[PDB]
């Protein structure tokens, strides 16, 4: 059973057993308010009644193209990504079929059924939350249209279902929309002619990367200028312009060359057919008015010229979308389906679009399908949906949030994590020194590990909880290679906290161990102090060997002392030879960045394979996938 706030509880399952006892146990740990749902039907998700959450709870897709049976949790802002490109495209289409009138009116072909098996029926069910009825105005928009399809018992939940059974006689699949608070019985959505009640409440705006700007301004220019009021000065100017355009047409007819042509072509037409007509050359705008051909112009400041820059036009096309979003639709719920915005978009503009999607409130509800990590640089309070590489189309969903503790490092944290989302196996390392060594070792051993799905994500100064929880929920394999560290508390002497051990324990869900005290003489300094700490680290590692065994099961590899000591065990003679020093480990730790580069330069292929095959560096084998 998975909680709404990310809490996970484990329970024992018994055969031929009602679920009521499990429901009672969960309620006692935390009944009428809560609702229990399994795979979109009433791990088990829970519904905590009046909470601050999205209207959209989850969507179920059955027998639609790729999706044999898929249930995906949702939120206001949803990002879908993954290797399965057809799965991502079909997911967006399933939303369009449910909510977009233009897509729905075409019906379902034979290809739209799973495995082209028209015997099975297509079902697309969207579950909504109406608990925050008074806080949310969009909930009131839906309730007003729905009217009596709801029940007071189930006033918090609502379903919008799409059903389609193929007609072999007519070679046609008819889409029938139903809705209601009870999933077992749903009434048909009322409608007259082409439109139904659902089209009044839901507006789907499909943003495609290849959108002509002037085309976009063409349709919306009508609303933008009729919605606003017109004072006396505007009316006088409007009439004055009409006079000016009329004079332009009159002056055109006064030219000798134009008058000569239209007289000649009139005689030519009269000879063709004896009809009492005349031909005039008039300006098209002056006939239709200035409104017909008005278009936006990018004007550089200090420059008189008007320019019809492609990138400038691409970005401003979103400004119109932002402008309309503020005031175009105040009477309906607007859902934006943004598909591959990064196509032919500079990475700096991708970050700009990322800030609009997540930081701003312009796009309250959207589904974003992306292939570029840059669009996720500002991601926050969004639901991440990952389509697995398998052809079976499995979808893993995680509700991404950044806590207040991570608020100061949110920018750095998001930039690193965004690239890891597009990977199969992620190895969590500490700093660049680990990255330098592992990149060299992997280069000599498995040079195309990045192609296969490997990724080296470096995290420093923070607990692994944020990264692991996101990666685990999305179905991405995570490997943690950390080292046993002792951190001294500020203002207190001789006492250290097992920072390295605590981070791994926090991953397991256990509480942090208490700080331990280490007694050293004042004379003991430098190398003598360091080796004393190493002795304590070795003792602590032995003492908690049971926990270390648990870490290995969870793909957490904790070094006994640090990476350098583990590296020395794997290649001692080689490291000692090239470092030409009595104690290579101490020298390597003096300047970690520069000495590691020097060590990596002098490493041979045999040494790299020795590191790869060593027991301590088992994380490399896990990352490779062997």
């Amino acid at each position: 059973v998975a909680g709404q706030d990310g809490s996970v509880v484990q329970f024992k399952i018994k055969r031929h057993t009602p679920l009521s006892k499990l429901m009672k146990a969960y309620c006692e740990r935390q009944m009428r308010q809560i609702r229990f749902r399994f795979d979109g039907q009433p791990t088990i998700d829970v519904f905590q009644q009046q909470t601050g959450g999205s209207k959209f709870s989850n969507i179920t897709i059955k027998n639609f193209r790729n999706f044999e049976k898929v249930n995906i949790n949702l939120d206001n802002k949803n990002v879908i990504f993954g290797m399965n490109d057809i799965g991502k495209t079909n997911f967006l289409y399933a939303l369009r079929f449910l909510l977009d009138k233009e897509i729905r009116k075409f019906g379902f072909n034979k290809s739209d059924y799973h495995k082209h098996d028209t015997s099975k029926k297509i079902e697309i069910i969207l579950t909504l939350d109406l608990s925050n009825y008074e806080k949310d105005e969009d909930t009131k928009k839906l309730i007003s249209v729905v009217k009596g399809a709801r029940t007071s018992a189930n006033a918090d939940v609502f379903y919008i279902a799409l059903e389609s059974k193929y007609d072999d006689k007519e070679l046609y699949g008819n889409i029938i929309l139903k809705w209601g608070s009870e999933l077992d019985n749903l009434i048909d959505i009322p409608g007259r002619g082409n439109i139904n009640a659902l089209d009044n409440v839901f507006k789907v705006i499909y943003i495609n990367p290849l959108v002509d700007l002037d085309k976009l301004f063409a349709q919306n220019k009508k609303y933008i200028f009729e919605e606003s009021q017109g004072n006396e000065s505007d009316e006088g100017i409007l009439n004055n312009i009409k006079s000016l355009t009329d004079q332009v047409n009159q002056q055109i007819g006064e030219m000798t060359i134009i008058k000569g042509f239209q007289q000649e072509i009139t005689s030519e037409y009269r000879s063709l057919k004896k009809e009492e007509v005349s031909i005039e050359l008039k300006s098209e705008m002056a006939i239709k008015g200035f409104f017909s051909d008005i278009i936006p112009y990018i004007k550089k400041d200090g420059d008189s010229n008007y320019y019809p820059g492609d990138g400038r036009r691409k970005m401003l096309s979103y400004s119109i979308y932002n402008y309309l979003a503020k005031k175009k639709y105040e009477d309906k719920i607007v859902i934006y389906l943004i598909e591959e915005p990064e196509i032919s978009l500079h990475r700096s503009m991708q970050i700009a679009l990322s800030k609009q999607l997540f930081e701003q409130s312009t796009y309250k509800y959207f589904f974003l399908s992306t292939h570029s990590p840059e669009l996720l640089y500002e991601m926050d309070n969004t639901r991440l949906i990952r389509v697995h590489s398998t052809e079976k189309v499995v979808c893993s969903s995680h509700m991404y949030n950044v806590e207040e503790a991570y608020g100061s490092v949110k920018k750095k944290l998001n930039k690193a994590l965004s690239s890891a989302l597009f990977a199969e196996r992620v190895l969590l390392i500490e700093g660049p020194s680990e990255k330098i060594l592992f990149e060299k070792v992997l280069d000599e051993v498995e040079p195309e590990y990045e192609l296969n799905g490997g990724f080296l994500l470096e995290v420093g100064g923070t607990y692994f909880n944020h990264y692991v929880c996101t990666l685990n929920d999305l179905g991405i394999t995570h490997i943690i290679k950390t080292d046993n560290d002792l951190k001294s508390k500020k203002g207190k002497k001789g006492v250290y906290e097992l920072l390295g051990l605590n981070r791994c324990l926090n991953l397991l869900g256990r509480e942090n161990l208490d700080e331990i005290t280490i007694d050293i003489p004042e004379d003991i300094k430098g190398k003598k102090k360091k080796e004393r700490l190493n002795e304590r680290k070795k003792e602590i590692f032995k003492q908690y060997k049971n926990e270390v065994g648990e870490f290995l099961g969870e793909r957490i590899y904790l070094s006994e002392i640090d990476l350098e000591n583990d590296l020395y065990s794997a290649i001692g003679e080689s490291m000692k030879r090239i470092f030409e020093n009595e104690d290579p480990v101490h020298y390597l730790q003096k300047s970690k960045l520069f000495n590691m580069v020097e060590l990596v330069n002098n490493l041979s292929t045999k040494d790299c394979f020795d590191v790869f095959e060593h027991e301590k560096f088992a994380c490399l084998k896990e990352l490779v996938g062997s």
Binding site: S144, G148, A155, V201
Partner: protein
């Protein structure tokens, strides 16, 4: 005047005289509010006379906003009773019943309520002073949560005319829509079978929240005999009759009316016509 009443958006008491400004103010105020409000909310206009409902609707014209224009009894049936009867009272109660008020009268609420379930038809009350339909609608709103949610989410202002003819039960429901459901009200009362003049007159003196506005004049049963007289010289006259009138009752009324088309036979048809729902009036009918 009209300008100040347009600007005000709260509860407004209109006390127009002679009936000249009723429809004119209503249509103007509705148009101003609809054009000003860009949200999803809509308005509901309720009129005692079905004729006033269509004549009002004509001036607004076609609109997809979802506004409701109709009779007072048609409002509760279409918006409150029919959709949310089952939710408030269980699935046993029906929602395909077509209300009529010329048959199956009820003695009391504890008698009218349960007989409603079996008959699958909505019956009026033998006592004009109390209206069974509106207290049932009020009861549904109190009992059903979704009904309360729908009304609040659908309408932001209610337009009511001829509030001096409003029943006490009707006033009770409209007050309910105002105070706990926080819905703006625009009632109109000129200084119906069970008309209660007390509620409208008492509203002006007692309700401090309501704003009293007077519209200048220039800017009883006989009226129910003019349209039948010109009809002699059937759906049009039903539109003048207060409330939604069932086609089954039309077939019964029409045989009475066509019987009229000597003096003696003129008198007795008006006797039963008045019974179904003046000494000088019958003489006036004899003259015409």
């Amino acid at each position: 005047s009209r300008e100040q009443i347009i600007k005000d958006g709260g509860n407004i008491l209109v006390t127009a005289g002679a009936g000249s400004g009723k429809t004119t103010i209503l249509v103007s105020k509705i148009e101003a509010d609809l054009k000003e409000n860009k949200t999803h909310y809509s308005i509901a206009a309720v009129t005692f006379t079905n004729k006033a409902a269509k004549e009002i609707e004509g001036r607004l014209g076609y609109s997809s906003r979802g506004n409701f224009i109709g009779t007072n009894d048609g409002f509760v049936e279409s918006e409150i009773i029919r959709p949310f009867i089952k939710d408030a009272f269980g699935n046993d109660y029906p929602d395909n019943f077509t209300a009529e008020y010329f048959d199956n009268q009820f003695a009391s609420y504890d008698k009218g309520l349960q007989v409603l379930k079996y008959q699958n038809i909505l019956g009026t009350y033998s006592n004009p002073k109390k209206n069974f339909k509106f207290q049932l609608a009020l009861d549904i709103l109190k009992k059903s949560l979704v009904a309360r949610q729908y009304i609040f989410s659908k309408y932001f202002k209610i337009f009511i005319d001829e509030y001096q003819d409003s029943d006490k039960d009707m006033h009770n429901l409209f007050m309910y829509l105002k105070d706990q459901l926080k819905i703006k009200l625009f009632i109109v009362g000129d200084p119906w079978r069970g008309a209660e003049p007390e509620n409208f007159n008492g509203l002006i003196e007692n309700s401090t929240d309501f704003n009293k506005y007077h519209l200048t004049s220039n800017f009883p049963n006989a009226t129910l005999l003019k349209e039948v007289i010109k009809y002699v010289k059937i759906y049009d006259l039903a539109a003048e009759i207060v409330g939604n009138l069932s086609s089954r009752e039309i077939k019964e009324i029409q045989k009475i009316i066509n019987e009229l088309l000597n003096q003696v036979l003129i008198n007795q048809v008006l006797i039963n016509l008045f019974a179904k729902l003046d000494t000088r009036e019958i003489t006036a009918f004899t003259e015409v």
